[PDB]
Write an enzyme that holds these catalytic residues in place. Structure first.
Site, PDB file in Angstrom:
ATOM      1  N   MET A  33       0.857  -1.189   0.000  1.00 51.23           N
ATOM      2  CA  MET A  33       0.000   0.000   0.000  1.00 51.23           C
ATOM      3  C   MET A  33       0.895   1.240   0.000  1.00 51.23           C
ATOM      4  SD  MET A  33      -1.125  -0.045   4.053  1.00 51.23           S
ATOM      5  CE  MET A  33      -2.035   1.449   3.948  1.00 51.23           C
ATOM      6  N   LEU A  41      -6.258   6.480  -0.797  1.00 51.06           N
ATOM      7  CA  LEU A  41      -6.825   5.347  -0.025  1.00 51.06           C
ATOM      8  C   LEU A  41      -8.360   5.412   0.037  1.00 51.06           C
ATOM      9  CD1 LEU A  41      -5.259   4.117   3.414  1.00 51.06           C
ATOM     10  CD2 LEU A  41      -7.747   4.449   3.105  1.00 51.06           C
ATOM     11  N   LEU A  47     -11.046  -1.165  -1.997  1.00 51.67           N
ATOM     12  CA  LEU A  47     -10.914  -1.205  -0.561  1.00 51.67           C
ATOM     13  C   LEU A  47     -12.252  -0.978   0.095  1.00 51.67           C
ATOM     14  CD1 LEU A  47      -9.269  -1.260   2.179  1.00 51.67           C
ATOM     15  CD2 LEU A  47      -8.800   1.205   1.784  1.00 51.67           C
ATOM     16  N   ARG A  62       0.318   1.162  -3.618  1.00 51.81           N
ATOM     17  CA  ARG A  62      -1.047   1.476  -3.993  1.00 51.81           C
ATOM     18  C   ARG A  62      -1.378   2.975  -3.875  1.00 51.81           C
ATOM     19  NH1 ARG A  62      -4.873   1.484  -6.860  1.00 51.81           N
ATOM     20  NH2 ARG A  62      -6.723   0.117  -6.745  1.00 51.81           N
ATOM     21  N   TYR A  63      -0.879   3.626  -2.816  1.00 54.52           N
ATOM     22  CA  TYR A  63      -1.333   4.966  -2.464  1.00 54.52           C
ATOM     23  C   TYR A  63      -0.255   6.053  -2.440  1.00 54.52           C
ATOM     24  CZ  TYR A  63      -5.113   1.862  -0.808  1.00 54.52           C
ATOM     25  OH  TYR A  63      -6.028   0.850  -0.719  1.00 54.52           O
ATOM     26  N   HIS A 117      -3.566  -6.355  11.566  1.00 58.28           N
ATOM     27  CA  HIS A 117      -4.593  -5.338  11.373  1.00 58.28           C
ATOM     28  C   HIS A 117      -5.959  -6.020  11.203  1.00 58.28           C
ATOM     29  CE1 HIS A 117      -1.270  -2.591  10.360  1.00 58.28           C
ATOM     30  NE2 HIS A 117      -2.151  -1.628  10.553  1.00 58.28           N
ATOM     31  N   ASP A 139       7.768  -1.408   9.790  1.00 60.02           N
ATOM     32  CA  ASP A 139       7.320  -0.550  10.851  1.00 60.02           C
ATOM     33  C   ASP A 139       6.058   0.181  10.467  1.00 60.02           C
ATOM     34  OD1 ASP A 139       9.444  -1.212  12.501  1.00 60.02           O
ATOM     35  OD2 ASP A 139      10.264   0.861  12.573  1.00 60.02           O
ATOM     36  N   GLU A 189       1.562   2.286  15.882  1.00 60.17           N
ATOM     37  CA  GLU A 189       1.531   1.436  17.070  1.00 60.17           C
ATOM     38  C   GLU A 189       0.230   1.534  17.833  1.00 60.17           C
ATOM     39  OE1 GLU A 189       5.021   2.355  19.219  1.00 60.17           O
ATOM     40  OE2 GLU A 189       6.309   1.050  17.994  1.00 60.17           O
ATOM     41  N   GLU A 215       1.021   1.352  23.678  1.00 57.02           N
ATOM     42  CA  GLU A 215       2.423   1.571  23.308  1.00 57.02           C
ATOM     43  C   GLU A 215       2.709   3.051  23.165  1.00 57.02           C
ATOM     44  OE1 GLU A 215       4.047  -1.469  20.365  1.00 57.02           O
ATOM     45  OE2 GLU A 215       1.913  -1.347  19.871  1.00 57.02           O
TER      46      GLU A 215
HETATM   47  C1  HEM Z   1     -11.514  -3.505   4.297  1.00 57.06           C
HETATM   48  C2  HEM Z   1     -10.413  -3.586   5.038  1.00 57.06           C
HETATM   49  C3  HEM Z   1      -9.606  -2.361   5.502  1.00 57.06           C
HETATM   50  C4  HEM Z   1     -10.043  -1.087   5.683  1.00 57.06           C
HETATM   51  C5  HEM Z   1     -11.476  -0.516   5.478  1.00 57.06           C
HETATM   52  C6  HEM Z   1      -8.896  -0.321   6.114  1.00 57.06           C
HETATM   53  C7  HEM Z   1      -8.884   1.026   6.398  1.00 57.06           C
HETATM   54  C8  HEM Z   1      -7.799   1.835   6.581  1.00 57.06           C
HETATM   55  C9  HEM Z   1      -7.793   3.293   6.709  1.00 57.06           C
HETATM   56  C10 HEM Z   1      -9.053   4.194   6.643  1.00 57.06           C
HETATM   57  C11 HEM Z   1      -6.510   3.676   6.897  1.00 57.06           C
HETATM   58  C12 HEM Z   1      -5.941   5.116   7.066  1.00 57.06           C
HETATM   59  C13 HEM Z   1      -5.682   5.524   8.521  1.00 57.06           C
HETATM   60  C14 HEM Z   1      -6.966   6.086   9.051  1.00 57.06           C
HETATM   61  O1  HEM Z   1      -7.697   6.835   8.343  1.00 57.06           O
HETATM   62  O2  HEM Z   1      -7.278   5.755  10.204  1.00 57.06           O
HETATM   63  C15 HEM Z   1      -5.694   2.490   6.890  1.00 57.06           C
HETATM   64  C16 HEM Z   1      -4.351   2.446   7.032  1.00 57.06           C
HETATM   65  C17 HEM Z   1      -3.581   1.290   7.103  1.00 57.06           C
HETATM   66  N1  HEM Z   1      -4.033  -0.022   6.945  1.00 57.06           N
HETATM   67 FE1  HEM Z   1      -5.878  -0.610   6.563  1.00 57.06          FE
HETATM   68  N2  HEM Z   1      -7.798  -1.147   6.170  1.00 57.06           N
HETATM   69  C18 HEM Z   1      -8.197  -2.417   5.811  1.00 57.06           C
HETATM   70  C19 HEM Z   1      -7.375  -3.559   5.769  1.00 57.06           C
HETATM   71  C20 HEM Z   1      -6.038  -3.646   6.100  1.00 57.06           C
HETATM   72  C21 HEM Z   1      -5.207  -4.870   6.165  1.00 57.06           C
HETATM   73  C22 HEM Z   1      -5.835  -6.230   5.882  1.00 57.06           C
HETATM   74  C23 HEM Z   1      -3.960  -4.453   6.500  1.00 57.06           C
HETATM   75  C24 HEM Z   1      -2.634  -5.153   6.758  1.00 57.06           C
HETATM   76  C25 HEM Z   1      -2.277  -6.283   6.243  1.00 57.06           C
HETATM   77  C26 HEM Z   1      -3.984  -3.009   6.652  1.00 57.06           C
HETATM   78  C27 HEM Z   1      -2.911  -2.232   6.975  1.00 57.06           C
HETATM   79  C28 HEM Z   1      -2.899  -0.869   7.053  1.00 57.06           C
HETATM   80  C29 HEM Z   1      -1.704  -0.118   7.345  1.00 57.06           C
HETATM   81  C30 HEM Z   1      -0.270  -0.662   7.528  1.00 57.06           C
HETATM   82  C31 HEM Z   1      -2.176   1.332   7.356  1.00 57.06           C
HETATM   83  C32 HEM Z   1      -1.289   2.588   7.575  1.00 57.06           C
HETATM   84  C33 HEM Z   1      -1.316   3.139   8.995  1.00 57.06           C
HETATM   85  C34 HEM Z   1      -0.785   2.111   9.957  1.00 57.06           C
HETATM   86  O3  HEM Z   1       0.447   1.872  10.008  1.00 57.06           O
HETATM   87  O4  HEM Z   1      -1.638   1.487  10.640  1.00 57.06           O
HETATM   88  N3  HEM Z   1      -5.239  -2.592   6.420  1.00 57.06           N
HETATM   89  N4  HEM Z   1      -6.508   1.407   6.681  1.00 57.06           N
HETATM   90  C1  CHD Z   2     -12.985   4.961   9.547  1.00 60.69           C
HETATM   91  C2  CHD Z   2     -13.592   5.838   8.469  1.00 60.69           C
HETATM   92  C3  CHD Z   2     -14.172   7.003   9.260  1.00 60.69           C
HETATM   93  C4  CHD Z   2     -14.091   8.336   8.532  1.00 60.69           C
HETATM   94  C5  CHD Z   2     -14.316   9.422   9.558  1.00 60.69           C
HETATM   95  O1  CHD Z   2     -15.374   9.404  10.229  1.00 60.69           O
HETATM   96  O2  CHD Z   2     -13.423  10.288   9.708  1.00 60.69           O
HETATM   97  C6  CHD Z   2     -14.704   5.212   7.591  1.00 60.69           C
HETATM   98  C7  CHD Z   2     -14.889   5.955   6.243  1.00 60.69           C
HETATM   99  C8  CHD Z   2     -15.380   4.931   5.222  1.00 60.69           C
HETATM  100  C9  CHD Z   2     -15.731   3.722   6.101  1.00 60.69           C
HETATM  101  C10 CHD Z   2     -16.005   2.378   5.396  1.00 60.69           C
HETATM  102  C11 CHD Z   2     -17.195   2.413   4.413  1.00 60.69           C
HETATM  103  O3  CHD Z   2     -18.387   2.868   5.086  1.00 60.69           O
HETATM  104  C12 CHD Z   2     -17.443   1.047   3.749  1.00 60.69           C
HETATM  105  C13 CHD Z   2     -17.509  -0.132   4.754  1.00 60.69           C
HETATM  106  C14 CHD Z   2     -18.900  -0.228   5.391  1.00 60.69           C
HETATM  107  C15 CHD Z   2     -19.029  -1.343   6.427  1.00 60.69           C
HETATM  108  O4  CHD Z   2     -20.307  -1.188   7.066  1.00 60.69           O
HETATM  109  C16 CHD Z   2     -17.955  -1.234   7.512  1.00 60.69           C
HETATM  110  C17 CHD Z   2     -16.547  -1.154   6.914  1.00 60.69           C
HETATM  111  C18 CHD Z   2     -16.350  -0.138   5.784  1.00 60.69           C
HETATM  112  C19 CHD Z   2     -15.091  -0.551   5.015  1.00 60.69           C
HETATM  113  C20 CHD Z   2     -16.216   1.264   6.440  1.00 60.69           C
HETATM  114  C21 CHD Z   2     -15.210   1.318   7.604  1.00 60.69           C
HETATM  115  C22 CHD Z   2     -15.043   2.710   8.261  1.00 60.69           C
HETATM  116  O5  CHD Z   2     -16.199   3.092   9.020  1.00 60.69           O
HETATM  117  C23 CHD Z   2     -14.656   3.728   7.198  1.00 60.69           C
HETATM  118  C24 CHD Z   2     -13.266   3.350   6.644  1.00 60.69           C
END
Ligand code: HEM
Ligand code: CHD
Ligand code: HEM
Ligand code: CHD
Ligand code: CHD
Ligand code: CHD
Ligand code: FES
Ligand code: FES
Lengths: 359, 359
Positions: free
Chosen positions: A12, A28, A34, A100-101, A199, A276, A279, A283
């Site tokens: 990513m 993202l 996603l 990816r991003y 995650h 890395d 966290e 932590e």
């Molecule tokens: C549908 C599944 C997933 C969703 C909706 C999702 C959502 C997100 C979002 C919204 C962020 C940005 C940070 C934030 O806005 O809070 C993020 C960052 C990240 N995600 Fe995911 N994620 C998913 C699956 C995964 C999986 C399966 C992995 C790892 C194998 C992963 C690893 C990461 C990592 C490494 C980051 C960067 C920030 C950090 O180090 O935690 N994600 N993800």
């Molecule tokens: C965490 C983030 C919150 C944005 C915000 O309020 O700042 C939101 C924005 C889009 C959301 C996603 C989208 O609504 C699409 C998905 C809907 C499913 O019901 C849950 C996971 C799902 C993958 C969501 C997870 C999470 O609530 C997300 C990632």
């Protein structure tokens, strides 16, 4: 020689500096592989802008950004040196980074590979365990690339789309766990809880058939087998975002619960992301870890090192690419089955893209 | 000779005939180790009375009851005959059946073992993958019995509390899968989806740290490894009871989704319960199975044969008990760690019971 075999290392990515956070988040929240949102093209910019400060602060807490580009290059360099000697027949090998991003983006990498006039091109996921949200999105980008540019590949493609139990990968984890166990007082080593922390996924995604939790669970078992079950363990799930249900137990709630129940020595293991990364609450937040130690008297929470620059990790990567070449496989058998409740029509297109490749 | 070593084979049991359903359900809904209900002593009888007709009807659909006692006995006999040869120093061995919810009950079995004046008693779970709801409940019954009768064991206890990746178990599953694959037309065999189906857990139990999903996942990977990934697979989760969220994807919904997405040949594998048990909606309901074949043209849904039966299975059980004996272990390392969010005080007591045992 011009390069013969291109190894596209897919991940990513991560913002290199805090200045890179906004556009990382933008790309993202725009990824329909996603998540799908209503008025997505309007909503992604807004969400990216809205969450940028929170995420910059998290990256600041871990040194000012993600080191993924530098580590992935290091590993790519080491992989390539071994491949050139392992597989003279497909040499010279060249690694390419396809994030990816963030730059270099998957599409920028495909564009370079094509200009390099490679004979063979391997989409080599850097996530050991397959999720549609991670490897699926990266693979879908490869298909979406050729479909957007309205033309066909000039290179022979295949994919290494998962490797959750690769022997050298398992060996690396077991090694890093043992090294970190050494940092606990000798009298307490046998008492340490190993918390494998991957995650999380939303339950909507778990429930549609995502392969990730089962594959993560396999990596954990293989690691504990290698460790001869020396300590007790649980697989828990970190960093869930938002208010919807995600797969638990959550890492934070499990650390608290374990300390409330007398477990004062905890070793966190990054089992599903090899660099890395951000966290967990206990932590990072000193207010929280203070309360924990006052109420339950937590003694040691430590985190095992990321696979990062360990050369046995480069040996793993090369071993995988070498086995892949020898096998003549185009993708795993698992890639040929979409989630039972997949609602993304691109998934099957990407599958056929790989299974149909020349050779 | 008088028996030297007792092997208490633990399982939930099942109603032998349709008349056995009510009391089976009564004891199940009364089990605080399984579920917690307000006013449980009052509610359980009512729930048991209200669900008896539906559960009778389900057992009628599979031949009029559960074969678990007969199969468990047969395996017990085979196990013991091999153990007398394998471990002459602990011979003679005697198996005892300890069912949670039907005769012979865990408590009735403990009472017989004590009367037999055994030197050693092994609490041997017949669930290969540990859940607090299954093995945990059976083990808590062993501690709860001595705490009930206000006295201490006259035998040396230990437990084989899980075995999700035992090599002979994995060999049995792989054998039964291959045997069943042979019933699909050879032209279709490589396309058949292997759908491993384990009984689900409520999300509240998953989120508290139950070890089961990760251990079941491990069994799956070891099976697919032995099968050389010959067919594509998913692990899905069956029989979820009631309105609350349970771990998915659900078996029924996944069968429907797979067929709607072009997968016409499906092999169901009972990966987490080794005896014949209640089947799924697409296996039992003619109206449903018809709708499915018409709307998306499903061709074959088959279910692999249950293990409890096969002599390599008896050979598995004996190998486990023999290795357990050679090891001198009192329980797995895993049993020494309770769920991060366990709210059941008996769990720690039971743990201490085993880890504190003489020898
Ligand atoms: C549908 C599944 C997933 C969703 C909706 C999702 C959502 C997100 C979002 C919204 C962020 C940005 C940070 C934030 O806005 O809070 C993020 C960052 C990240 N995600 Fe995911 N994620 C998913 C699956 C995964 C999986 C399966 C992995 C790892 C194998 C992963 C690893 C990461 C990592 C490494 C980051 C960067 C920030 C950090 O180090 O935690 N994600 N993800
Ligand atoms: C965490 C983030 C919150 C944005 C915000 O309020 O700042 C939101 C924005 C889009 C959301 C996603 C989208 O609504 C699409 C998905 C809907 C499913 O019901 C849950 C996971 C799902 C993958 C969501 C997870 C999470 O609530 C997300 C990632
Ligand atoms: C907290 C977790 C669990 C709950 C609450 C639960 C609930 C129930 C209930 C209420 C019944 C009685 C039938 C009914 O009323 O519908 C039942 C039967 C049964 N359960 Fe569970 N169960 C749990 C976990 C498990 C696990 C982990 C397994 C397998 C390893 C399992 C296997 C069975 C079997 C085999 C039956 C008998 C009927 C059948 O063949 O399906 N259960 N369960
Ligand atoms: C309703 C929808 C659920 C996704 C879906 O349809 O499956 C969710 C997903 C992300 C949500 C948005 C994001 O959380 C960002 C915003 C957060 C604010 O609290 C409300 C508006 C806000 C703009 C949200 C509105 C709405 O709840 C969204 C759009
Ligand atoms: C009160 C309690 C809610 C708190 C909890 O989750 O334990 C719940 C858990 C089990 C529930 C009961 C069970 O679901 C069985 C019954 C099902 C009926 O259709 C509704 C009432 C019914 C008699 C329930 C009443 C009440 O909501 C109970 C008793
Ligand atoms: C099986 C039955 C469902 C009846 C129905 O078909 O609706 C009910 C009666 C007791 C219930 C259980 C009790 O409410 C206690 C548990 C409470 C958790 O929040 C969900 C699972 C939980 C374990 C419940 C699952 C389910 O609702 C049960 C098992
Ligand atoms: S979402 Fe998993 S295959 Fe499409
Ligand atoms: S509920 Fe799992 S240890 Fe008590």
């Amino acid at each position: 020689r011009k390069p013969k075999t291109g190894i596209l290392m897919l991940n990513m990515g991560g913002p290199e500096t805090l200045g890179d956070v906004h556009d990382f988040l933008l790309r993202l929240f725009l990824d329909r592989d996603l998540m799908t949102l209503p008025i997505q093209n309007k909503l992604a910019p807004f969400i990216a802008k809205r969450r940028t400060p929170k995420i910059q602060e998290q990256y600041r807490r871990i040194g000012g950004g993600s080191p993924i580009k530098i580590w992935t290059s290091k590993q790519g360099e080491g992989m390539v040196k071994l491949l050139d000697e392992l597989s003279p027949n497909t040499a010279p090998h060249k690694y390419y980074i396809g994030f990816r991003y963030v730059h270099p983006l998957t599409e920028e990498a495909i564009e370079e590979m094509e200009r390099d006039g490679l004979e063979r091109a391997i989409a080599f996921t850097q996530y050991p365990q397959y999720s549609c949200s991670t490897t699926g999105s990266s693979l879908n980008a490869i298909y979406r690339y050729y479909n957007q540019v309205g033309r066909k590949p000039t290179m022979k493609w295949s994919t290494i789309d998962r490797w959750p139990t690769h022997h050298l990968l398992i060996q690396c984890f077991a090694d890093h766990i043992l090294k970190e166990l050494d940092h606990f007082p000798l009298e307490k080593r046998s008492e340490v809880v190993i918390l494998f922390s991957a995650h999380s996924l939303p339950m909507s995604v778990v429930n549609r058939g995502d392969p990730y939790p089962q594959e993560v669970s396999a990596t954990v078992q293989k690691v504990m087998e290698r460790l001869e079950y020396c300590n007790p363990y649980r697989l828990v799930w970190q960093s869930k975002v938002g208010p919807m249900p995600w797969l638990g137990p959550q890492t934070d709630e499990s650390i608290k619960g374990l300390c409330e129940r007398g477990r004062k020595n905890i070793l966190l293991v990054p089992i599903a992301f090899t660099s890395d990364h951000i966290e967990t609450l206990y932590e990072l937040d000193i207010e929280y870890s203070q309360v924990l130690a006052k109420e339950c008297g937590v003694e040691n929470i430590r985190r095992a090192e990321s696979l990062n620059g360990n050369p046995l990790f480069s040996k793993a990567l090369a071993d995988l690419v070498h086995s892949h070449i020898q096998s003549n496989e185009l993708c795993s058998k698992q890639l040929t089955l979409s989630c039972p409740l997949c609602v993304n029509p691109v998934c099957r297109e990407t599958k056929s893209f790989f299974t149909s490749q020349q050779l």
